[PDB]
């Protein structure tokens, strides 16, 4: 288990602008050490990460009819790949 840490690529102009730099970012398992992220994404993209940052995102609250609702919580993660490489998959 190690592809389970990386969830999915974040799709935002803020995330995209990171591609211009050496900073690919994406969703991650809630309980996940920045260090284990390093090792997860490192061996999942054949690249070498240098600097990882992390955020918690309180899932906004939606609702339907007279019924209250609560979206799940997620963990943003922004990685700084070594100066001289890229993720062609994330580029897309």
């Amino acid at each position: 288990t190690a592809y389970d840490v990386i969830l999915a690529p974040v799709l935002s102009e803020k995330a995209y602008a990171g591609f211009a730099e050496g900073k690919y970012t994406f969703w991650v398992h809630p309980k996940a050490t920045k260090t284990e992220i390093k090792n997860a994404v490192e061996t999942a993209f054949k690249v070498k990460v240098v600097k990882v940052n992390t955020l918690h995102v309180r899932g906004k609250k939606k609702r339907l009819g007279r019924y209250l609702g609560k979206r799940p919580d997620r963990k943003k993660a922004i990685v700084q790949v070594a100066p001289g490489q890229k993720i062609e998959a994330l580029e897309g």
Binding site: T1, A2, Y3, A8, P9, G92
Partner: protein
């Protein structure tokens, strides 16, 4: 019917068993990620592939 199929493949996955188990699972795990990875972008996702690949991993892990 795909059950009877993959099942025998697992006792067949006894060349190396625990080793090929982890190997094969790690592979399908990657494929699973590659799947939802392309699924989120939209223009590379159908549907049934996921739940089939998920439960696929399951029995393999069994």
């Amino acid at each position: 019917m795909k059950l009877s199929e993959v099942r025998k493949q697992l006792e067949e996955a006894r060349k190396l068993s625990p080793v090929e188990l982890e190997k094969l699972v790690r592979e399908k795990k990657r494929e699973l990620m590659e799947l939802r990875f392309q699924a989120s972008i939209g223009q590379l996702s159908q549907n049934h592939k996921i739940r089939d690949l998920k439960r696929q991993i399951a029995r393999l892990l069994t």
